[PDB]
Amino acid sequence: QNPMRDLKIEKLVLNISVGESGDRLTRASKVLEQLSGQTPVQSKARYTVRTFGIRRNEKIAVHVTVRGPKAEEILERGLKVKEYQLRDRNFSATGNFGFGIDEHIDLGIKYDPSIGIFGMDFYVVMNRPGARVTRRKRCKGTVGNSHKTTKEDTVSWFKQKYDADVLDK
Amino acid sequence: VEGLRRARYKFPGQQKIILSKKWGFTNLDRPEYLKKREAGEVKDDGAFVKFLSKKGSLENNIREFPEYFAA
Amino acid sequence: QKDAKSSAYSSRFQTPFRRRREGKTDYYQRKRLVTQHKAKYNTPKYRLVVRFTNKDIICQIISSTITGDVVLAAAYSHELPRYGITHGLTNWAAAYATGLLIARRTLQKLGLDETYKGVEEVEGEYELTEAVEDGPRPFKVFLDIGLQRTTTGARVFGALKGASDGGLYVPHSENRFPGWDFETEEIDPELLRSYIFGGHVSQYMEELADDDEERFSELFKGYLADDIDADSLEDIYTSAHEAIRADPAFKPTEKKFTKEQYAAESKKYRQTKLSKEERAARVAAKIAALAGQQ
Amino acid sequence: SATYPMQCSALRKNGFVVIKSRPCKIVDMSTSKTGKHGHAKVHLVAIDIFTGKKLEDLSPSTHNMEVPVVKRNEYQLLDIDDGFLSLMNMDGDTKDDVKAPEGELGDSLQTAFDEGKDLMVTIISAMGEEAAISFKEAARTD
Amino acid sequence: GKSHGYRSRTRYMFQRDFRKHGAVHLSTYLKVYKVGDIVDIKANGSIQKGMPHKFYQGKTGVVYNVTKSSVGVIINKMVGNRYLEKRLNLRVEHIKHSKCRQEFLERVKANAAKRAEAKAQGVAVQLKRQPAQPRESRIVSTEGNVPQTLAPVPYETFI
RNA sequence: GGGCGUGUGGCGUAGUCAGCGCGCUCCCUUAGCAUGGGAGAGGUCUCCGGUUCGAUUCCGGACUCGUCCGCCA
RNA sequence: GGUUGCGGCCAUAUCUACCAGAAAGCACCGUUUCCCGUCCGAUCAACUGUAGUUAAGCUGGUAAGAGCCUGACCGAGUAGUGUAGUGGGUGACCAUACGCGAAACUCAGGUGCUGCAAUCU
RNA sequence: GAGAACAGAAAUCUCCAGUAGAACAAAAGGGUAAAAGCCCCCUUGAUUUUGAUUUUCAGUGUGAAUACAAACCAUGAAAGU
RNA sequence: AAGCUCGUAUCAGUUUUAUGAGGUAAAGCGAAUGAUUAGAGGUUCCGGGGUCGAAAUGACCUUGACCUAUUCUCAAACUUUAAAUAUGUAAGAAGUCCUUGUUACUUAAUUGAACGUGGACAUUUGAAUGAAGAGCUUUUAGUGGGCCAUUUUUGGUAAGCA
């Protein structure tokens, strides 16, 4: 039935794609670092694209992963930025959901003229207890079908907790 | 037979015109196909026909081919 | 509709080995362990297999035959209450005591125990069981840590240290023991001795009992139930060590029942297969049910 | 090695050859049969890259001719003083050993450096002697 | 030009097989070879070290040397009009014991057992093998087996 | 018949797995002696596939010209 | 007979969808002082066995299940092939004699066995 | 395949499926999934001394390769390599 | 050609038995790779053409892709399967079994490895057939343009062609 079927936030990953290396990358990394409380990780570019202007391996994006109640707090701040309204398209078939926001001023960092303005992509990964079965090195296994997270369960949880409503489209 | 006999002149070598004992382009005989199609265990396709087998899952064998199980 | 595998895929699929499918054996490591120099013809190669489950430490001495692996002697951590250790059956010192127990047990049953007494007075120094002259060589054994991560401070090396001080000749270097400084390539013996005698749990016991008492009631509850304070665990490790060096003889349990007595209940509880005729009756009833126009 | 052999028929137009121990660049190749029975002979007309002289040669086609290694390298000017260019390599290396060009290329380069463009110089190496052949201007990275 | 390399024409010979690729099982490493054993040679394409040449695939030889990870085997190779002796150093993944030899040794020990037990009576042991003799007289009955008459079948198209 | 080279804006050429030059058309500018600058408008890179992060670029095929040969009987 | 540790053969063991699991054991699970490693104690490291749970892992069962394995006088002595003839046929090719002998197909059955040590109502 | 501001066919992040349909300098063919692939750490065994063996083969040479012996090293907890 | 050492064997262009190895012939494509014919059912934030539509990530047909279940035909440089003919080894006395000597190798260890001492097993001594003697050495001639037939097979339209 429901002894330990309770959904929880596995992680919150915050992604910023400035698109080109340098001062803008460092400023976005500083914004991510002060928001998370952790140092962020920059991610290299896989392939050279002329239209974007990117070459291979210039650390073109910066992202951070936060777990636990701190991640829950930043998700609360993101949802009150989004006014607790999310599209049905935002949720995925696996049960994970994300949204994208513009500027950290709405998050309330306040503005420095040097640092500029950078928007963010918030993504929440949802799992039940017992997810260690896939992650552990010894006796790695696949999770059973009933215990899997799904879109209907995650939208029901998102309606019940955070007292939010989903948009029909 | 006359159409195949006219077509045989365009070919080298020797060819024979044989009236087959099968029903159409299938591989069963005429009375075998007749006693198969009186039951509902054949079901038509675009030009060919799909046949029932005693293997497989019963749910799929009942959503297809309903008249034979309507016994 | 999405998670569907074709018959071609399932026909061309090659399964791995069963232990690899279960995720319990690294065969790349197993080949390098159990193979022998072919000029040593039928000489067995012996593995100290150390495995860590929850609530247990498993130590075995295992050689390999074609029909399967063969165990000389095994020593688990749940038989440490016989030697006086009741709490912390998976800590680093429990791994040490289990290694010491399996070492003393193997040298006793091989008869190599009156010689090669091992490290009687332990101090945390790094040394190996050297060969005594004009006599037999010490028993040589190699670790099998399995899929477990090699890490400075891991308790597979505590099991190694216990087995090495027990008198086994196990080849090892000292750079994975706790207390190994990385920048100065030397081993600190007093921290390793503190870990052998449980210093890392007793120091935590003190530094958590002085401030946070609800945690001190949540964990270490059995220590209060058996009135074990912080300083006495050192001497109960010492008494456990001398009890092991007294008798590792391994009296087994009395099993409370017989094999067929357990087998009767478990055979009653296990589910059985459905035969061909009743399967045919089942599918005939199903045809008469759904396809019989309800 | 500095130079490597090749066959006359393997040679083709706009390639480098060694004629009378000079690095030369071919402008003309022509093969004519010696006698009806015999093999064709290759006539080669080439221009020395450094001096600009015209040197020709005729050989058997199966004969092997010497071929230099020519490397063209890209540098930025620092100064033109006393007829010796000072250049600057990628990773910041600097050479002053190159003598300035003496012709209309040198005159145009001198006027361009006097009126202050950023000039990109191509210098070639072949058989241990060094010279500058052409200059452009950097359209970006001003 | 022509091409005769060391592993020329070895495509299907050194393919692995269907659905038994991957690492090799531990019985080949746990098997024990002694000097004088008779072994079959079949190369394993997964192991590139200690490989035999394509001539010795399916050849049977005698062990003369045992080293750390390999075995020295003696083969007789027909060169011209005589056989030459060839010594091969092969890793143990490419060899296995010949089963005909152990069958013959089983025949030797059972044969010695028969001779030993029948020596106590002297009953003309007859220890040599004999081939398939012609089958002797018998009486076949028709009780429930009356003969059925068969005839050739006429011709039909059957398409 | 075969071989070799060839084909990229109006024109002319380049090359790294569409550029500039010269023209042009506009806008400025300049006593000039001379003009200069900025912008444009400009291309199935011969073509078609495949290859490749990506093809001018690599490869397969085809086409267009230009060339050189086709002997001794 | 169940479970664990180490295995042998490496699908009769895999895959898909459901159902069940007494006891014990595994497992999920609780914690970050210490050793250690991460952007992130998620993995890894360490501590407790305490706060809990069979929901998952795992094991077993079900399915005219997919796959896989075995057998057949099922196809079929068919296809192919070694030897022979001053056999047939313009040829292409084909019969016969003495021998060897498939694969697909069809049908029937099956769905892990087992070694060492420990432990269990 | 399903998602996430700018961000779209292709930028980065997340999950699921995935027997290799990728990659391993190059031609092609083999081989490889807790790897032989990708990333990281440490190194110089791409070292010394001469023998034996395999292929081509006259059982000559050359090239390439295989398994050892005697040292001296690298790496790892170690078996080993 | 000269022989030499021996006297029925440490033989054999052969079969049988036991045991290997192979990827051709055949077969297969509702099995992987590649080629390929025809409809059927679906997918359009997810195609293109028309017609109806103010337009519409509109509608209705049609045509292309992709998926699903089928269907027709193929492969020297494709393959799950897989012959026939050829092909490796063994069928003992230089063997088997018992006991215990050596070593500087090897093992935790008289543990094992190799070679041994002493003892037991003989004419059905280890399948068939035949043996015409078996084994060994030296020296030297000529030759080093070939061609034809059956079967397999390559280039070529073919050839008394290559």
Residue labelled with tokens 């094999």: C259
Say if residues C99 and C59 touch (Cβ distance below 8 Å).
Answer: yes
d(CA C180, CA C191): 9
Structure tokens at A137: 């090195």
Nearest CA in chain A to C20: A139
Q: Which of C116, C109, C105, C98 is nearest to C49 (CA)?
A: C98
Chain E contact present for C41, CB below 8 A = yes
b/e C47-58 (16+ beta carbons within 10 angstroms → b): bbbbbbeeeebb
Q: What is the 3-state secondary structure (H, E, C) of chain D?
A: CCEEEEECCCCCCCCEEEECCEEEEEEEEEEEECCCCCCEEEEEEEEECCCCCEEEEEEECCCEEEEECCEEEEEEEEEEECCEEEEECCCCCEECCCECCCCHHHHHHHHHHHHCCCEEEEEEEECCEEEEEEEEECCCCC
**Chain E residues closer than 8 Å to B20 by CB:** 157, 159
**Chain E residues closer than 8 Å to B18 by CB:** 157, 159
Residue to substitute from B41, B54, B57, B58, interface C, most C β-carbons within 10 A: B58
Q: What is the CA radius of gyration of chain E?
A: 26
d(CA C171, CA A127): 44
B24 SS3 class: coil
How many residues belong to chain B? Answer: 71
The phi and psi torsions of E108 (rounded to 5 degrees) equal -65, -45
Chain E contact present for C65, CB below 8 A = yes
Chain E contact present for B22, CB below 8 A = yes
Say if residues B15 and B8 touch (Cβ distance below 8 Å).
Answer: yes
Tell me, yes or no, whether chains E and C touch by having 3 or more C-beta pairs under 8 A: yes
- Structure-determination technique: cryo-EM
Cβ of B22 near strand I (distance < 7 A): no
Residue labelled with tokens 């020395």: D48
d(CA E129, CA E134): 15
Q: In sequence order, which ranges of E1-158 are alpha helices (DSSP H)? A: 27-30, 99-118
d(CA A9, CA A128): 9
C153 SS3 class: coil
Contact check, Cβ <8 Å, B70/C291: yes
Residues 49-108 of E with CB under 7 A from strand I: 57-60, 76, 78, 98-101, 103-105, 107-108
The phi and psi torsions of A141 (rounded to 5 degrees) equal -140, 175
Our CA angle for A41, A46, A49, nearest 5°, is 120
Within 10 angstroms of residue C174's Cβ, the number of other Cβ atoms is 17
Judged by C1' against the alpha carbon of C110, the nearest nucleotide is I108
Q: Which of residues 68-127 of C touch B (CB under 8 A)?
A: none
> What is the DSSP secondary structure assignment for residue E94, as one 8-state letter?
G
Say if residues C163 and C172 touch (Cβ distance below 8 Å).
Answer: no
Q: What is the CA radius of gyration of chain D?
A: 19
Name the residue closest to the C1' of H33 by its CA: E22
Say if residues A19 and A52 touch (Cβ distance below 8 Å).
Answer: yes
Structure tokens at E108: 């030797």
The phi and psi torsions of A145 (rounded to 5 degrees) equal -70, -40
Our CA angle for B32, B36, B38, nearest 5°, is 120
d(CA E53, CA A29): 60
Say if residues D124 and D21 touch (Cβ distance below 8 Å).
Answer: no
Q: Which of residues 139-158 of E touch B (CB under 8 A)?
A: 157-158
Q: Report CA(D67)–C1'(G20) in Å, whole number.
A: 85
d(CA C292, CA D83): 108
Resolution expressed in Å = 2.7
Structure tokens at B57: 């899952």
How many residues belong to chain A? Answer: 169
Chain C contact present for E64, CB below 8 A = no
Say if residues A92 and A155 touch (Cβ distance below 8 Å).
Answer: no
Residue partners of A25: CB distance under 8 A and separation at least 6: A18, A42, A59, A60, A62
CB-count burial class (<10 Å; 0-12, 13-18, 19+) for C93: buried
Say if residues C206 and C230 touch (Cβ distance below 8 Å).
Answer: yes
C151 SS3 class: coil
Q: How far is CA D60 from the centre of its chain?
A: 26
Minimum distance, in Å, between the CA of residue C50 and any CA atom of chain E: 21
Q: Which nucleotides of F are covered by protein (CB under 7 A)?
A: 4-5, 20, 53-54, 68-72
Minimum distance, in Å, between the CA of residue E152 and any CA atom of chain B: 22
The phi and psi torsions of C65 (rounded to 5 degrees) equal -120, 170
Cβ of B47 near strand I (distance < 7 A): yes
Q: Report CA(A44)–C1'(F49) in Å, whole number.
A: 35
Q: What is the CA radius of gyration of chain C?
A: 26
